[PDB]
Amino acid sequence: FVPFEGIKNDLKGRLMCYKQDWTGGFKAGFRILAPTTYIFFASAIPVISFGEQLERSTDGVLTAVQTLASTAICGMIHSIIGGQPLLILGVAEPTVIMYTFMFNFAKARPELGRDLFLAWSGWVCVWTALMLFVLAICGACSIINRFTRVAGELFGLLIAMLFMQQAIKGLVDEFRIPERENQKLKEFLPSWRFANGMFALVLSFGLLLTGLRSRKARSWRYGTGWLRSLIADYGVPLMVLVWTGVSYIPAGDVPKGIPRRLFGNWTVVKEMLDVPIVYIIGAFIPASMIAVLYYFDHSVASQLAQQKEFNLRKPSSYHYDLLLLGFLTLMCGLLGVPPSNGVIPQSPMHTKSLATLKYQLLRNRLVATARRSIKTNASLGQLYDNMQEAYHHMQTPLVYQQPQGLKELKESTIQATPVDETLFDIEKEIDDLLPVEVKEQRVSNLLQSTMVGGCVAAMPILKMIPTSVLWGYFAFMAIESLPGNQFWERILLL
Amino acid sequence: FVPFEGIKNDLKGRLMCYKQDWTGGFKAGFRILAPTTYIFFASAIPVISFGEQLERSTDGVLTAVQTLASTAICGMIHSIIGGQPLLILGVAEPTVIMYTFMFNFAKARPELGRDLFLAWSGWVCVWTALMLFVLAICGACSIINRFTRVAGELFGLLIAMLFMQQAIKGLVDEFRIPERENQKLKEFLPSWRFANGMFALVLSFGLLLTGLRSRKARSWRYGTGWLRSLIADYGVPLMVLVWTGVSYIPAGDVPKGIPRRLFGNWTVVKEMLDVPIVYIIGAFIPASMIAVLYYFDHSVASQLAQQKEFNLRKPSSYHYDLLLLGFLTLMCGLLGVPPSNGVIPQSPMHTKSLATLKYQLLRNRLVATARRSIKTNASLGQLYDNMQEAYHHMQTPLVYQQPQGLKELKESTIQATPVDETLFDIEKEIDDLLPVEVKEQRVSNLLQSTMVGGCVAAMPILKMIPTSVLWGYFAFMAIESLPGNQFWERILLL
């Protein structure tokens, strides 16, 4: 717990893999788009829903534009000067709840009111940034190492429950009347309300089930490997588009608002000084709560994305990441947008997507080299050396760790068996000698954040997405937040 | 093709396993209820739907009561004096189509009209019975042996397509207005029609998916074996009841007819003679068509239930079955109910259910005897002999064939391994040395037919079932009609 020690160590560790990170990201060509698109959707949809929630709860002060902008800019800044690019930054539900409480508080104060809510929020963000700077400098993140696996598994289960609760609330609300829209409308009649609710159920459950099924496309006996990979990679986005189109089928015999549809930044410094100095000091309380919440969430999200099973070859940057989070919180507060922070399951999903990308690249290369070696000599022991050489050749030269390497050939495999092609199927065997590795780089995070920012200008296209699709995705991510963790497995076995 | 040869041979073969059939059925206690209940539902639901269709298409002359009664009585008669009890008898879609055509024809004839439609149908049935008697006596069923596997696979695919088409038509009609009900009603408004359609979609798809998932309960890692078996056995009926109850949840905020709900015999001999003799002769044409259709359907259904992969130990009764079908057609025509005939996939489903029952009984006995032997000596070769002895002891003593017997212990199994319990798991190994056998008896068919007959008196309970559940079951049976047949597999691989 020495001042500036952890930050300096993290910077030293991460400064010798920066060019390597960018060059590795550029090494893979357009194949990096699949994880990028997957995480882009996973980050945009919850953020858009949170923006709509804030707009309904803040009388239009904060909308999806502000949340999307915060997520975007903070994501780009982290991707460029972050330290742990595997982390995905975005506006989380606890931030929305806290901002709702602050807005409700300020609305009842004649001193603050509604026109000064953003300024008071900015002062709260300044206090939170100071607290985060103090925590990072003093090495308070060292306690994160103390927290064991269950400390993160419980948080993941809690986030899954929160996402499922949000989805269920949305589905139920599809049956009810909004508190802002015109009450005397054709689309809001009890019969049409029931129809909207059941249609929302159909769309949401269809999206959820089809996406879950498509996630297992690679393990299908039918179609070609190209199509199977395309489905396994872009199924959930494709399902989103497909069910959005399905929602338009009965448009010729139904009122306008059936099913219900969805729908830069500025500075608040000038009006920040107009706040009387009895609430600038009072911001220490909500700032304290938000600082504690962010200290916990950022670190837990970063560590859940750096699981030992992934065999990462680069160090961690907890302290420097917290310092940059303080800086980003200050910037967001000054810009009049809610702060962003490390979110789950977005970060572990990003890590798993990168691991799958590297796995597929390695599988393709090894299958190619095995096929090339089968024709020439194919000695079953000289071919294996060729695949090992190719594996080492693909690898990025670093200084911290070394490649895991192809694992030992199983005794049963050699016993079953130059090499006879009839008795040696490459596709069946390669999967048995492929380690778990992650393609670590900064390109995927940068593109994902830029795409989220681009959604600000694509609002007309986003107007065509029904809310039922959002609730189906929320449940999909909730199930993704318990993808087989040890705690969930033990509860299941109990 | 000698007169009365095939009938006599079939009777000779089947007359020496009658008491054995009944005693084998009574050997299994209440465990025979699961296949009985499964096939009872599979036979009752399509028959009820066909009855509603006929009622709508025959101006109330024929309802679900007549179809249920025909199915019941014919099923009991076949189960007692049939010859091939694996066959399931019921009113099929081709019979409904033919009867619809005959009713439409008669409605336009002033000589016949509507009050004499049943009498003309009875004369048609008399002609069909005579044709079936002639076909059976002359040994025309010998050509059935000529027809190969594809001849039955194509028929199964056609029946699957017909069932799926019926389900899709029902789902679409849930969105439209019936042509008999009052047009000026609250439940038939366009908004309420749309709500009913989407609710029907939800219920049907929920039933279909939940039943398909529950069909694989035995291969689950969770719960106890008792619960897993109960689910795998009674899932589809339980799902029917569960979704029927779910349909009642919104009853407190929806009109009466949302979702749409579903709702002995006599003699027509006296009015049969009132038909002028220009149509009694004219019945030869529809009688000829129905006779050809029945000759094909009965034989194909019987042979699809006697696949070689099932290793049946009893002979076939094609000719005698056709003769009894002629008798039953005559009886049904005289009773004023549509004739019954062998139906698919009900018969193959019955055979598979009986095979699963025997498999589970054998697995339980072998697991018990292996556990008992493990404590005493457990020599891995003396225990196997004990399991073989138990298998032979359970077996029914017949004269035609012999038990297949436990297959050879795999070389890998013995190589992997008194016997160490840690390295020899019974549950994992038993499945590897269990042959495919069918529990052939007449009790299951008799109980299923009696239950179908009992549904006549349980009409009030059947009034609570929505039509969407029927369409979900129709799709479930359609998928059951292509359960992995070779033709469907080849088309899939193409």
Side-chain angles (χ1 to χ4, degrees), chain B residues 41-268:
Chain B
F41 269 79
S43 150
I45 281 155
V47 155
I48 285 157
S49 156
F50 299 151
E52 298 248 328
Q53 186 177 338
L54 277 169
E55 190 190 30
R56 285 182 258 115
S57 178
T58 60
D59 301 344
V61 174
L62 291 170
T63 80
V65 174
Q66 276 79 65
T67 56
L68 281 169
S70 178
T71 307
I73 313 313
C74 284
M76 319 184 73
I77 289 172
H78 176 77
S79 95
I80 299 179
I81 59 172
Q84 179 49 255
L86 290 170
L87 243 188
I88 299 301
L89 260 65
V91 181
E93 183 62 26
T95 301
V96 170
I97 295 160
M98 276 301 314
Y99 257 61
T100 299
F101 285 143
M102 308 171 10
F103 183 83
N104 285 332
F105 173 86
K107 190 184 50 208
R109 315 294 315 175
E111 288 119 296
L112 292 175
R114 173 203 193 267
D115 260 35
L116 254 50
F117 157 67
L118 274 181
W120 189 57
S121 278
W123 278 116
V124 166
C125 285
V126 162
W127 278 109
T128 310
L130 291 192
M131 261 153 253
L132 293 168
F133 291 156
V134 169
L135 285 172
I137 285 157
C138 269
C141 269
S142 305
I143 300 158
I144 301 307
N145 308 1
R146 242 81 74 71
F147 276 30
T148 167
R149 180 68 58 104
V150 307
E153 263 45 34
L154 273 158
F155 196 61
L157 174 83
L158 202 82
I159 292 297
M161 274 157 64
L162 225 56
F163 271 93
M164 186 60 56
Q165 159 165 338
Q166 189 113 355
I168 288 161
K169 245 187 60 53
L171 289 177
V172 167
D173 269 344
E174 289 287 321
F175 279 95
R176 314 255 167 264
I177 319 87
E179 71 281 310
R180 301 171 93 212
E181 307 212 62
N182 187 353
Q183 261 210 128
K184 303 300 113 210
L185 286 184
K186 186 159 183 270
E187 58 143 353
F188 282 122
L189 267 66
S191 82
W192 279 124
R193 291 207 323 261
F194 198 77
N196 182 71
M198 308 289 330
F199 198 11
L201 275 171
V202 167
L203 289 174
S204 85
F205 267 97
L207 172 86
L208 171 66
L209 299 174
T210 53
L212 283 174
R213 249 161 218 151
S214 80
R215 282 255 94 203
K216 319 173 199 241
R218 285 231 172 70
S219 98
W220 285 352
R221 306 166 37 239
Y222 306 91
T224 163
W226 158 278
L227 187 62
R228 295 222 291 294
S229 68
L230 280 206
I231 296 174
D233 277 349
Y234 302 95
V236 188
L238 210 85
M239 278 312 96
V240 165
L241 309 193
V242 159
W243 287 103
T244 301
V246 165
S247 68
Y248 275 99
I249 288 168
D253 74 59
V254 187
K256 246 58 56 175
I258 304 297
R260 293 176 194 166
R261 306 276 176 207
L262 254 172
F263 312 106
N265 43 61
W266 217 338
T267 205
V268 301

Side-chain angles (χ1 to χ4, degrees), chain A residues 423-434:
Chain A
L423 208 61
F424 197 72
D425 212 56
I426 310 133
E427 267 68 5
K428 188 184 139 207
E429 296 299 326
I430 293 315
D431 302 1
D432 282 326
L433 68 153
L434 279 186

Side-chain angles (χ1 to χ4, degrees), chain B residues 165-470:
Chain B
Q165 159 165 338
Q166 189 113 355
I168 288 161
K169 245 187 60 53
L171 289 177
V172 167
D173 269 344
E174 289 287 321
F175 279 95
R176 314 255 167 264
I177 319 87
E179 71 281 310
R180 301 171 93 212
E181 307 212 62
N182 187 353
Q183 261 210 128
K184 303 300 113 210
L185 286 184
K186 186 159 183 270
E187 58 143 353
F188 282 122
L189 267 66
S191 82
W192 279 124
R193 291 207 323 261
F194 198 77
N196 182 71
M198 308 289 330
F199 198 11
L201 275 171
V202 167
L203 289 174
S204 85
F205 267 97
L207 172 86
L208 171 66
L209 299 174
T210 53
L212 283 174
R213 249 161 218 151
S214 80
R215 282 255 94 203
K216 319 173 199 241
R218 285 231 172 70
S219 98
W220 285 352
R221 306 166 37 239
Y222 306 91
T224 163
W226 158 278
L227 187 62
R228 295 222 291 294
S229 68
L230 280 206
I231 296 174
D233 277 349
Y234 302 95
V236 188
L238 210 85
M239 278 312 96
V240 165
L241 309 193
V242 159
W243 287 103
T244 301
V246 165
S247 68
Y248 275 99
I249 288 168
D253 74 59
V254 187
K256 246 58 56 175
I258 304 297
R260 293 176 194 166
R261 306 276 176 207
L262 254 172
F263 312 106
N265 43 61
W266 217 338
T267 205
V268 301
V269 275
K270 290 287 215 132
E271 86 197 359
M272 213 150 142
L273 310 169
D274 292 333
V275 177
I277 306 95
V278 188
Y279 298 98
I280 294 179
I281 293 121
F284 189 93
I285 293 164
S288 320
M289 277 185 281
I290 296 168
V292 161
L293 270 167
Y294 281 14
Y295 164 81
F296 189 80
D297 205 345
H298 208 64
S299 307
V300 169
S302 201
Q303 90 183 16
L304 281 192
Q306 296 177 65
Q307 300 273 53
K308 281 142 37 213
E309 42 166 272
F310 290 126
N311 302 308
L312 300 179
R313 287 175 72 203
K314 278 153 187 178
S316 60
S317 199
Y318 288 110
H319 312 90
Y320 177 70
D321 279 354
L322 204 70
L323 192 88
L324 184 61
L325 178 63
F327 268 96
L328 290 171
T329 297
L330 169 65
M331 171 213 81
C332 277
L334 287 195
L335 280 175
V337 299
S340 284
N341 86 100
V343 280
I344 53 161
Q346 283 95 332
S347 298
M349 292 166 65
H350 188 219
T351 306
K352 275 127 97 140
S353 72
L354 295 172
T356 296
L357 166 67
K358 203 171 189 321
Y359 184 85
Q360 292 305 312
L361 261 49
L362 187 48
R363 214 232 199 192
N364 272 51
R365 175 72 84 80
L366 289 196
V367 152
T369 202
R371 292 239 145 102
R372 173 251 289 141
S373 298
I374 273 172
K375 41 166 298 153
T376 347
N377 288 118
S379 171
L380 184 48
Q382 175 183 301
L383 175 148
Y384 181 84
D385 299 347
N386 281 17
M387 323 203 315
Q388 198 105 52
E389 223 273 304
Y391 164 104
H392 268 80
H393 199 337
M394 295 202 8
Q395 302 324 285
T396 282
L398 303 174
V399 308
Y400 328 96
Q401 303 226 309
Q402 291 275 282
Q404 297 267 300
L406 303 193
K407 44 185 70 167
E408 151 164 31
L409 206 42
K410 268 78 164 174
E411 175 126 24
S412 68
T413 43
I414 50 167
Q415 211 72 355
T417 288
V419 55
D420 50 353
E421 317 92 32
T422 178
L423 208 61
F424 197 72
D425 212 56
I426 310 133
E427 267 68 5
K428 188 184 139 207
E429 296 298 326
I430 293 315
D431 302 1
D432 282 326
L433 68 153
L434 279 186
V436 200
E437 289 176 346
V438 182
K439 171 73 119 170
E440 307 169 73
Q441 34 68 52
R442 303 171 112 90
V443 168
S444 65
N445 206 327
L446 176 69
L447 291 179
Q448 164 260 346
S449 314
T450 312
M451 290 154 104
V452 169
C455 266
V456 168
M459 290 258 141
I461 300 288
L462 292 181
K463 278 230 175 106
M464 305 169 37
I465 300 166
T467 54
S468 26
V469 171
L470 269 61

